[PDB]
């Protein structure tokens, strides 16, 4: 039986724009911490929330920066840990909110341990219950990505090592994370190695890609985003040119070894949705076909304001199909954006820009790579700056 524990108006500091946004938040006994634009009782409950948080295992801190009566909460949004800053008008109101959130959080821990006692099986009642000895160090790629060769099988991989401070996804155009282990001070990620280089530097050397070449890269990106959305129910969030690499044959490999990419809804502090991936596709394909970003300015205040308020100009070299695709992908309202509807990736797949493309053939790597990397071997690091 879910019930509201506390509700009221909070000022939530913007994560990218220097502002405080008034929101009506509901704290419920299941830990849900849900923010609306208006009170649900004033709009007949017919409006979706803007923010969906969970105060399970949260951390709370009261502070007087930037404003008095501020508190910071480190909580969760579905699977991601986030940090949000709130403001209220009096110290008593802040004490009520921090106490109410903490009381709900403590009640959730007791419910959890009650649930583990009820679901404990016979094996759980017993009295008691990969490593770097494998893999060979070879070279370095990032600033700390290293190139390794598995001692047992003789296969090459790229090991990402991080000091302590998308696992089961398999797709031809996604980098597969094969192994994952840790030490007392480090986290290790053994993932496949695409030695064809970053598209960021390939586009930088070519200045601009043709519409055919961009259609090749875009189609393979769409294929991977369709798999993540429909099969894994995951938003990639980080689709950008720097996270796009090529394998030895010139096919896309989305990897994970930039304020200019932020979607309008993220700049306005709404929760991420599927449509942010299609915005990111619009930005990368605009870069590929125009040789520059749709919005850019050194002053990040100007840049965010261009993204939110100004029209995208397209060069006269862009064909009408290309302009229609980019205009649809770069709609500022995610509900109007191409791919923001219920059919998601099928909206892009059926767009005239991709006419004649058999999307099963894209998955099967039957498209002709317009550029073949000249890598001599799988140890050739010529494409890593």
């Amino acid at each position, epitope marked *: 039986d879910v019930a509201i524990v506390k509700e009221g108006w909070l000022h939530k500091r913007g994560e990218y724009i220097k502002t405080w946004r008034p929101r009506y938040f509901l704290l419920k006994n299941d830990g849900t911490f849900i923010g609306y634009k208006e009170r649900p009782q004033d709009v007949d409950q017919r409006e979706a929330p803007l923010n969906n948080f969970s105060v399970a295992q949260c951390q709370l801190m009261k502070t007087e920066r930037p404003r008095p009566n501020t508190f910071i909460i480190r909580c969760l949004q579905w699977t991601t840990v986030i940090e949000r800053t709130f403001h209220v008008e009096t110290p008593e109101e802040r004490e009520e909110w921090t106490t109410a959130i903490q009381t709900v959080a403590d009640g959730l821990k007791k419910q959890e*341990e*009650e649930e*583990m*006692d*009820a*679901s*404990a*099986e*016979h094996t*759980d*009642m*017993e*009295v008691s219950l990969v490593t770097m000895n494998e893999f060979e160090y070879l070279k370095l790629l990032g600033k700390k990505v290293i190139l390794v060769k598995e001692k047992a099988t003789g296969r090459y991989y790229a090991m990402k090592i991080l000091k302590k401070e998308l696992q089961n996804s398999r797709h031809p155009f996604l980098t597969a994370l094969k192994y994952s282990f840790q030490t007392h001070d480090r986290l290790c990620f053994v993932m496949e190695y695409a030695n064809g280089g970053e598209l960021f530097f390939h586009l930088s050397r070519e200045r601009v890609f043709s519409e055919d070449r961009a259609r090749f890269y875009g189609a393979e990106i769409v294929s991977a985003l369709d798999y993540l959305h429909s099969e894994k129910n995951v938003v990639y969030r980080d689709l950008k040119l720097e996270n796009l690499m090529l394998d030895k044959d010139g096919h896309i490999k989305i990897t994970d070894f930039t304020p200019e990419y932020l979607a309008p809804e993220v700049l306005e502090d709404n929760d991420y949705g599927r449509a942010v991936d299609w915005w990111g596709l619009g930005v990368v394909m605009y870069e590929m076909m125009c040789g520059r970003l749709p919005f850019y300015n050194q002053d990040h205040e100007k840049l965010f304001e261009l993204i939110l308020m100004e029209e995208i100009r397209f060069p006269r070299t862009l064909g009408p199909e290309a302009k229609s695709l980019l205009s649809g992908l770069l709609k500022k309202d995610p509900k109007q954006r191409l791919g923001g509807g219920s059919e998601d990736a099928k909206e892009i797949m059926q767009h005239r820009f991709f006419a004649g493309i058999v999307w099963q053939h894209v998955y099967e790597k039957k498209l002709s790579p317009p550029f073949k990397p000249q890598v001599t071997s799988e140890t050739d690091t010529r494409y890593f700056d």
Partner: nanobody
Amino acid sequence: QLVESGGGLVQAGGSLRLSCAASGIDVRIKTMAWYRQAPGKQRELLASVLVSGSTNYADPVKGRFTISRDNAKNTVYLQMNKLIPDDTAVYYCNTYGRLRRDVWGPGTQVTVSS
């Protein structure tokens, strides 16, 4: 709080029934298990009963011991039949949460004499 009782001195071939009386916690909604600790051996699991009532038993007690729950009394029983001298130990009862926190009651001594 869990209180074991019902132990004592019995002869080989006799029987006993231990009781695990709970106060403050609800065994009706918790997986309950029985344990024993021999003079110089490692503490071992013997039997468990799930919330549904399904029971599982370890090898040395199969066909001899029976674990049951009394929801009305908030108590879990261990019926010990076919006792032999090797069953001599102090017997304990616990939940999962108390098990991982090493929170144990006083237990009840069972001595089976020849």
